[PDB]
Amino acid sequence: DTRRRVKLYALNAERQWDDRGTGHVSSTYVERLKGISLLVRAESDGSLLLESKIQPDTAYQKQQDTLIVWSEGDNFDLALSFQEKAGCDEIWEKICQVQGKDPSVEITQDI
Amino acid sequence: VVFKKPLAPAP
């Protein structure tokens, strides 16, 4: 499959986006996180590269149709880079459903 | 070319 194929980037101390690996993204409820979460499974070894709860108030930003970019904590910035816009749209729609947004928005919070 | 890199982090 390629529709959900992604690269995970993380911003480092030197403010470079570090390539953390290629994988496939999905969403599901994760009990230990108590909410719908984004999961990325690594192409390399099938491990979870990402397991990130969709908080209700996180500002997710869609950039260039194929990037979903957000702050995961203090000094912790992440980006999902999608191979396909169609896949980006699916995950964006799910984020918007969880937060209660119109999926035509390009950022899920004001400011 | 396959995967875009972000321009800036989110606000």
Numbering used by the authors:
A (entry chain A): 4 to 114
B (entry chain B): 1055 to 1065
Sentences from the paper on this structure:
Recent studies revealed that protein phosphatase 4 (PP4), a ubiquitous and essential PPP, regulates a variety of cellular processes, including chromatin biology, DNA repair and cell cycle progression. The major form of PP4, conserved from yeast to human cells, comprises PP4c in complex with R2 and R3. Flfl14, the R3-type subunit of Drosophila PP4, has been shown to bind Miranda (Mira) and so recruits PP4 (PP4c–R2–R3Falafel) to regulate asymmetric division of neuroblasts. Here we show that Flfl directly binds the centromeric protein C (CENP-C) and brings PP4 activity to centromeres.
To better understand the molecular basis for the Flfl–CENP-C interaction, we co-crystallized an amino-terminal 122-aa-long fragment of Flfl containing the EVH1 domain (Flfl1–122) and the CENP-CFIM peptide and solved the structure by molecular replacement to 1.5 Å resolution as described in Methods. The final model comprises residues 4–114 of Flfl and 1055–1065 of CENP-C. We found that the Flfl1–122 fragment is composed of a seven-stranded β barrel capped by a C-terminal α-helix. Two concave surfaces are formed by the outside of each β sheet, one of which (strands β1, β2, β5, β6 and β7) forms the peptide-binding groove with contributions from an inter-strand loop (residues 66–69). The CENP-C peptide can be unambiguously identified as bound into that groove. The binding site lies in a highly conserved groove on the surface of the protein burying 1,700 Å2 of the total 6,700 Å2 surface of Flfl1–122 and corresponds to the surface responsible for binding proline-rich sequences in other members of the EVH1 family. Residues 1055–1065 of the CENP-CFIM peptide are well defined in the electron density, and include FKKP motif of the residues predicted to interact with the Flfl1–122 by peptide array analysis. The peptide backbone adopts a left-handed helical conformation similar to the polyproline II (PPII) helix28. This arrangement is mainly stabilized by the establishment of hydrogen bonding and van der Waals interaction between Pro1060 and Trp20. Additional residues flanking the PPII sequence provide directional specificity. In our structure CENP-C′s Phe1057 and Pro1060 provide the principle specificity and directionality of binding (see also the legend for Supplementary Fig. 2e). We suggest that Flfl–FIM interaction constitutes a novel mode of EVH1 binding in which a low proline content ligand is recognized in a PPII conformation.
